[PDB]
Amino acid sequence: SPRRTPQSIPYQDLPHLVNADGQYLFCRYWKPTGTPKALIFVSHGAGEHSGRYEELARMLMGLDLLVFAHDHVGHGQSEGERMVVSDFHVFVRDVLQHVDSMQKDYPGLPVFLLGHSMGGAIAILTAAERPGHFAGMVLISPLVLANPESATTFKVLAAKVLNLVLPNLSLGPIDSSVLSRNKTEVDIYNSDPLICRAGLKVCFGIQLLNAVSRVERALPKLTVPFLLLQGSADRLCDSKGAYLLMELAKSQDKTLKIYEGAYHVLHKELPEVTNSVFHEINMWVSQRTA
């Protein structure tokens, strides 16, 4: 039988790639009409998928960048049991595979990363593993600090004990109202059949804790240029992580923009925040491309 997405579409009808574990990843491209000035890989977050980046990708394609993405293993249209991963490094390894294939097709072009949330921790670990390789990185509320509520030192020991006894135990889903003050965007998030809203497995919560620990160790070697966008009222990726990244990263070109009162999903927030987000990414990437 032909391999199919978890929603039953054959992979032969869709852009895709097969990762080092033999799993199909669904791919997405936004190619400008002329010769692109650069490439940019878009890295989505936990439980979501690459289709959520449609409008940001069209803005980047308008600047003559060739934008590319895939659904991470266990997400959207890609294979894998939902929101589980054998080790968080699989995500970084699969971004590097896709980046290496796209650079072979477009030799000499500069390559940028854009990541949101978990996809921001993936973009940081990707750039840390290949110092001097990426021209820049745009981070929207990246996962950098264990959550002050869900991951105190006691709760982290508790998660490690649960992981030994019930790795497959499912924990409760997040309150969707903490994602954005924009009600329409909360409603779109609640009705997208490609989003996993089932709730965190303990073994995946451990992989997210490995991401935070790895990002912390990688910051003193991070030299890539970056733009960091963060909401002051983010209950998922606490704004303290954003200040810590600005302080410990060794990058010579680093910028932080704080959105006062904004929640987690900045690029899907109140129109006043979203418009400044798209404009700030547009100016930052346009100054660093030619």
From Swiss-Prot:
It is found in: Cytoplasm, Cytosol; Membrane. Keywords: Cytoplasm, Fatty acid biosynthesis, Fatty acid metabolism, Hydrolase, Lipid biosynthesis, Lipid degradation, Lipid metabolism, Membrane, Nitration, Phosphoprotein, Serine esterase. It catalyses: Hydrolyzes glycerol monoesters of long-chain fatty acids; a 1-acylglycerol + H2O = glycerol + a fatty acid + H(+); a 2-acylglycerol + H2O = glycerol + a fatty acid + H(+); 1-octanoylglycerol + H2O = octanoate + glycerol + H(+). The modification 3'-nitrotyrosine is found at residue 53. GO terms for cellular component: cytosol; endoplasmic reticulum membrane; membrane; plasma membrane. Changing residue 237 to A: Reduced 1-monoacylglycerol lipase activity. It is an enzyme of class 3 (hydrolase). Signal peptide: none annotated. Changing residue 196 to A: Does not affect ability to hydrolyze 1- or 2-monoacylglycerol. SUPFAM superfamilies: alpha/beta-Hydrolases. Detected in adipose tissue, lung, liver, kidney, brain and heart. It is a peripheral membrane protein. Converts monoacylglycerides to free fatty acids and glycerol. Hydrolyzes the endocannabinoid 2-arachidonoylglycerol, and thereby contributes to the regulation of endocannabinoid signaling, nociperception and perception of pain. Regulates the levels of fatty acids that serve as signaling molecules and promote cancer cell migration, invasion and tumor growth. Belongs to the AB hydrolase superfamily. Monoacylglycerol lipase family. This is Monoglyceride lipase. It comes from Homo sapiens (Human). The lineage of its organism: Eukaryota, Metazoa, Chordata, Craniata, Vertebrata. The gene is MGLL.
